[PDB]
Amino acid sequence: TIIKEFMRFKVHMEGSVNGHEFEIEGEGEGRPYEGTQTAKLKVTKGGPLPFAWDILSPQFSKAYVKHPADIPDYLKLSFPEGFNWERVMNFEDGGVVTVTQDSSLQDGEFIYKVKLRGTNFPSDGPVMQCRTMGLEASTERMYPEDGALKGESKERLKLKDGGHYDAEVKTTYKAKKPVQLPGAYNVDIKLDILSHNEDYTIVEQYERSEGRHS
């Protein structure tokens, strides 16, 4: 009854990257049980951003992961109260991003609130010079620990020169109430930028995410 086959969301992000402050507002929609979703993001303060969109793209929706019947869908089951998540991304050149997120259901729509901080990106590296061109498909290795659901992934940002620029990502996902946890499993993720204006103050992205066993 609570999570319909088709669901919209609204997202607000406040962030700082290498001391550059910004805000983003977005609107998304998708099919939670099919693991598909699309979002349109607008930079509302601090635009245009002087860094790679690709470090922000993974911060804009874990209710939209397709799960087999036998793996508890902890994050869908958390609604209507919802869940929080805390992420650390460690980039190979010493850049660090921390993210905190609150997910709730209000008036039939998911409501996302994101706070992000990025530091220690080299001024001449691929993030601050915008030399990335999207993310490779990734796998998030999920496991229960300390009464929460944790995830680890390796993100590979595509380089204008054909190589990759990598990050180690660790996320802890906590339902607001006690919700049945799964065992360990894998989530395959593919995030695509569909469109953007020339300065990436308007961006459309899509993600397909599906859970499976180890």
Phi, psi of 76 (to 5 degrees): -65, -40
Q: For residue 30, give Cα distances in angstroms to 155, 182, 184.
A: 23, 23, 25
Which experimental technique did the depositors report for determining this structure? X-ray
The yes/no answer on whether domain 7-212 falls in CATH 2.60.40.1260 is: no
Residue 54, SS3 per DSSP: helix
Q: Where are the domains of the chain?
A: 7-212
Residue 4, SS3 per DSSP: coil
Contact call for residues 103 and 49 (beta carbons, < 8 A): no
DSSP class of residue 66?
A: B
Look up residue 159 and give its two tokens: 């380089």
Look up residue 151 and give its two tokens: 């995830």
Query: Resolution (in Å) of the shown entry?
Result: 1.5
Pairing of strands 132-135, 138-145: unpaired
d(CA 114, CA 212): 27
